[PDB]
């Protein structure tokens, strides 16, 4: 395994240069609705998925898993990874969500606004904590490996994923220690970061059921890949 034998700094640099690009939307200020908005976000998310898949391949230890495992991990956490990315991009835009450099939206259909506010709160949470890119690429990798480590004969490593998750944890601590944080502050910040992952999970789950109802009502159509990702949560 190339992973596990990686140092903390080697882990960080590997996650950094594996980062997917920030894509643009099809938004036109001149053109008029909540329907066309979801169509813009659906098209954006679909193009983001292609980069996420190739991003996952460059995540240390991910390609060590079986192909059926890789499918499961992405099927379960694709919206979580998208959301934490959206939240990260919107970190410097208070009250706004930066879906794309040309698509910066504010809170102004119910239920989708509640999720919008939860996304804003998380973005505000990252900003008050002064989240670093090195910390973000670690958190996003954790989501990829942790969100589907359960819901999987003798099988297993699940056990390797747990080994890599420990490595990323060590990496996070190494980053905080280099930030001049005391030994107590490192544990607190570590807990703070991972508790946010529970919120990202929550927002993802509520996003799925909203996406499922949008599917079973047509209007805004979903791509073929995005449809198969959605059926994985049903």
């Amino acid at each position: 395994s190339l992973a596990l034998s990686l140092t903390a700094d080697q882990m960080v640099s590997a996650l950094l240069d594996a980062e997917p690009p920030i894509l643009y939307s099809e938004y036109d200020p001149t053109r008029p609705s909540e329907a066309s908005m979801m169509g813009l976000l659906t098209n954006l998310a679909d193009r983001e998925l292609v980069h996420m898949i190739n991003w996952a391949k460059r995540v240390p230890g991910f390609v060590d898993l079986t192909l059926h495992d890789q499918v499961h991990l992405l099927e379960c956490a694709w919206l979580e990874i998208l959301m934490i990315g959206l939240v990260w991009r919107s970190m410097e835009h208070p009250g706004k969500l930066l879906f794309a450099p040309n698509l910066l939206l504010d809170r102004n259909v119910e239920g989708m606004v509640e999720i919008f506010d939860m996304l804003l709160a998380t973005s505000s949470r990252f900003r008050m904590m002064n989240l670093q890119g090195e910390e973000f690429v670690c958190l996003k990798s954790i989501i990829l490996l942790n969100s589907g480590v359960y819901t999987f004969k003798s099988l297993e490593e699940k056990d390797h994923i747990h080994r890599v998750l420990d490595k990323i944890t060590d990496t996070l601590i190494h980053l905080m220690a280099k930030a001049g944080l005391t030994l107590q502050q490192q544990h607190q910040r570590l807990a703070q970061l991972l508790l946010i992952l529970s919120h990202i999970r929550h927002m993802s789950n509520k996003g799925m059921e909203h996406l499922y109802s949008m599917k079973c009502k047509n209007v805004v159509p979903l791509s073929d890949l995005l449809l198969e990702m959605l059926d994985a949560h049903r």
């Binding site: 292609v50 898949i53 190739n54 192909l67 499918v71 992405l74 890949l225 198969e228 990702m229």
Partner: peptide
């Protein structure tokens, strides 16, 4: 599946 395809390629 498409995800299975892209992961394999």
């Amino acid at each position: 599946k498409i995800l299975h395809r892209l992961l394999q390629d």
